[PDB]
């Protein structure tokens, strides 16, 4: 029933032998155990990034953490299981996820019956992330277009955290 072929260097392609390897892909009721290689992108830390670590995602700034963990653990969690830390899958460092900065935009308006001089306060953000030439950092947010004075005065146009604006010559 089983016989050899007279395969020779002088036969044409239809008869010439070939070494054939066959790839066949199966799905059964089991956890998957095989896939191809994966490719990571380069890690950037102190910038807003749309991150994906082992399938877990979010947007933020990722920098070195002062947290400790068991060799076992991979992710840190905040309220309602929001990820607040990851360990890198390749680099054995714990990285703290700072949510990417957000806040409202508060516009400091003179009476329009006086002038068109307007400054803008960006809430919950540093003047590293927003700027312009007249850029000052307040406790409330990043203030651009206004100047700062060391003296105290009464309060006409509130910024927050003890800081309040007004108009002077």
């Amino acid at each position: 029933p089983l016989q050899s072929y007279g395969f020779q260097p002088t036969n044409g392609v239809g008869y010439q032998p070939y070494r054939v390897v066959v790839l066949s892909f199966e799905l059964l009721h089991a956890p998957a155990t095989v896939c191809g290689p994966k490719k990571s992108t380069n890690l950037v830390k102190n910038k807003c990034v749309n991150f994906n670590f082992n399938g877990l995602t979010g947007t933020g700034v990722l920098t070195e953490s002062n947290k400790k963990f068991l060799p076992f653990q991979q992710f840190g969690r905040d309220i309602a299981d929001t990820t607040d830390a990851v360990r890198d899958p390749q680099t054995l460092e714990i990285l703290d996820i700072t949510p990417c900065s957000f806040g409202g935009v508060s516009v400091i308006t003179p009476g329009t019956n006086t002038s068109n001089q307007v400054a803008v306060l960006y809430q919950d953000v540093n003047c590293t992330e927003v700027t312009g030439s007249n850029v000052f950092q307040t406790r409330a947010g990043c203030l651009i277009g206004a100047e700062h004075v060391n003296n105290s005065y009464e309060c006409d146009i509130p910024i927050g955290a003890g800081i309040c604006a007004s108009y002077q010559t």
Binding site: K67, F69, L70, F72
Partner: protein
């Protein structure tokens, strides 16, 4: 090669041990300074976890539901693995977890299993557990489970196709009881098999021409409030359905 180890005494299992405490870590999470409420397959605090003793061996087949608790007080090192499966015979596919120096060998196949498994005892042999195998689904090597007088605790859970094993080995001064205080088990392996397990039994070894006690239980869906520190370690716990 397979031999009959059976004591042939009824040896009613004892329930003189309460299982005061013991959980496993539910996920890979860096939690700290938090009491986190988790609903998972935890063993109840203060439960009817059975006390068994071998050597004249005591290694009966006990049911496996969603998961199983196992512990031992060995110094004598007579335990070398566990067998799990739907029938533990040649009718269905089954899983053998066997420990030896430096590692554990894990195999899942349709095996022809003997009536009372044991290990050959220098040289070692698993032909006292199974006579043959074919139609294999899974093979795995990593790190030993029975790592080495500590209480050796393990939890075996079988969900979503994975056989999840957690463990801890904590020093003891006890012979027939458990140490008191809170402790949580860490994952040893997350094993991707696709196996249906309904019952299991212990693999013992002794030169055939010391002895050991075992504590075996089962786990239930329960809610626990778990206390985590600034290390990711669970340091304490409350069983929300006990009292």
């Amino acid at each position: 090669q397979c031999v009959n180890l059976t004591t042939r005494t009824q040896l009613p299992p004892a329930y003189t041990n309460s299982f005061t405490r013991g959980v496993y870590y539910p996920d890979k999470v860096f939690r700290s300074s938090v009491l986190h409420s988790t609903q998972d397959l935890f063993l109840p605090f203060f439960s009817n976890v059975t006390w068994f003793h071998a050597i004249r061996f005591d290694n009966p087949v006990l049911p496996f539901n969603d998961g199983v608790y196992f512990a031992s007080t060995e110094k004598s090192n007579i335990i070398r693995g566990w067998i799990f499966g739907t029938t533990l015979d040649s009718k269905t596919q089954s899983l053998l977890i066997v420990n030896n120096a430096t590692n554990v060998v894990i195999k899942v196949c349709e095996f022809q299993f003997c009536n009372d498994p044991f290990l050959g005892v220098w040289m070692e042999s698993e032909f006292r557990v199974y006579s043959s195998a074919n139609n294999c689904t899974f093979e795995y090597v990593s790190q030993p489970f029975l790592m080495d007088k500590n209480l050796r605790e393990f939890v075996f859970k079988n969900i979503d196709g994975y056989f999840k094993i957690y463990s801890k080995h904590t020093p003891i001064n006890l012979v027939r009881d458990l140490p008191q205080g809170f402790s949580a088990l860490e994952p040893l392996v997350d094993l991707p098999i696709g196996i249906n397990i309904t019952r299991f039994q212990t693999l013992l070894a002794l030169h055939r021409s010391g002895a050991a006690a075992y504590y075996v239980g089962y786990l239930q869906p329960r809610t626990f409030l778990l206390k985590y520190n600034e290390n990711g370690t669970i340091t304490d716990a409350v069983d929300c359905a006990l009292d």
